[PDB]
Paper text:
The pattern II group (binding shifted to the non-primed side) consisted of structures of nine protected peptides and one non-protected peptide that all bound uncleaved into the non-primed sites. Electron density maps of the peptides enabled the unambiguous interpretation of residues from P3–P1. The nitrogen of the amide protection group at the peptide C-terminus was bound approximately 3 Å away from the ND of catalytic H164. The amide likely shared a hydrogen bond with the deprotonated His residue. At P4 and beyond, the features of the electron density maps became weaker and less precise; however, it was possible to model the peptides KPKKKTK, RLSAKP, GNYKEAKK, and EVCKKKK up to P8 in the averaged kick Fo-Fc omit maps. MPD molecules were bound to the primed sites of all structures. Three sequences [name], EVCKKKK, and IILKEK were among examples of [name] single protein cleavages, but they were cleaved two or three times in the peptidyl form. Peptides from patterns I and IV bound to [name] consistent with the observed protein cleavage sites, whereas the peptides from patterns II and III did not bind according to their cleavage site found in proteins. Their binding appeared to be biased by the absence of the negative charge of the reactive site Cys, which caused a shift in binding. Similarly, the binding of C-terminal carbonyl from amide of peptides of group II, as well as the binding of carboxylic terminus from the cleaved peptides of groups I and IV, can be explained.
Addressing the elusive specificity of cysteine cathepsins, which in contrast to caspases and trypsin-like proteases lack strict specificity determining P1 pocket, calls for innovative approaches. Hence, we set out to determine the crystal structures of cathepsin complexes with representative peptides of cleaved substrates. As a working model, [name] was chosen because of the resolution of diffracting crystals (up to 1.3 Å) and crystal packing with accessible active site cleft. Reactive site mutants [name] and C25S of [name] were used in structural studies.
Residue numbers in the entry: 1 to 221
The structure:
């Protein structure tokens, strides 16, 4: 596998969005993964609707602004036959009436693939071969809230009890040795002002830190 990967440098990733006061990170992680897979398929980067997921995927088990899971979102897109664009179905950060319109759909998936649970090397392989990957993580720490630079490492992090969905857009390392001071490149949904332009470097090959490889998946387009 490559020593480092960053799909942002290849055009697969939209600018950082902001879920605001709605527990919809699962939806942003899902649209993020879908955006990259659709780009791989068509060469066009089109921002996708998190509000369409929030409003319409309760049947698949999501709970709108009160939480959800990326796999259930990819399941909804499959069963639904489509997903609208961000422009056509804008984000308002509150649970609303499902207004899915097929004519505005710009994405589809046939289901999703799960990364072997808990294996950072499996996640490394998925990231290098597929594109950005949706992952769950333990983000319940002030250290994460006020993260700004460096490789994030939090001793109180859990690899099993997760509360936030994010997007792995690559991986890398500091220095000249590709085999140490490694990190996962993670896109968050708390706006570009949070973290490092909306991103965070999370310690990689440090025992599945914060659960990054516990529940990773990607849509099949
Ligand atoms: Cl999930
Ligand atoms: Cl940057």
């Amino acid at each position: 596998l490559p020593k480092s990967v960053d799909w942002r440098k290849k055009g697969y990733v939209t600018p950082v969005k902001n879920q605001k006061q709605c527990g919809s990170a699962w939806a942003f992680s899902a649209t993020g993964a879908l955006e990259g897979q659709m780009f791989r398929k068509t060469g066009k980067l089109v921002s996708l609707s998190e509000q369409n997921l929030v409003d319409c995927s309760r049947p698949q088990g999501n709970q709108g602004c009160n939480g959800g899971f990326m796999a259930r979102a990819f399941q909804y897109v499959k069963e639904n036959g489509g997903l609208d664009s961000e422009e056509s179905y804008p984000y308002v950060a509150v649970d609303e009436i499902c207004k899915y319109r097929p004519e505005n759909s710009v994405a589809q998936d046939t289901g999703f693939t799960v990364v072997a649970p808990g294996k950072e090397k499996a996640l490394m392989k998925a990231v290098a071969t597929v594109g950005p990957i949706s992952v769950a993580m333990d983000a319940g720490h002030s250290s994460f809230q006020f993260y700004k630079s460096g490789i994030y490492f939090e001793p109180d992090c859990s690899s099993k009890n997760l509360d936030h969905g994010v997007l792995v857009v690559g991986y890398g390392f500091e220095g000249a040795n590709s085999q140490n001071s490694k990190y996962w490149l993670v896109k968050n949904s708390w706006g570009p002002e949070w973290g490092s332009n909306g991103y965070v470097k999370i310690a990689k090959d440090k025992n599945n830190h914060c659960g990054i490889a516990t529940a990773a998946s990607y849509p099949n387009v």
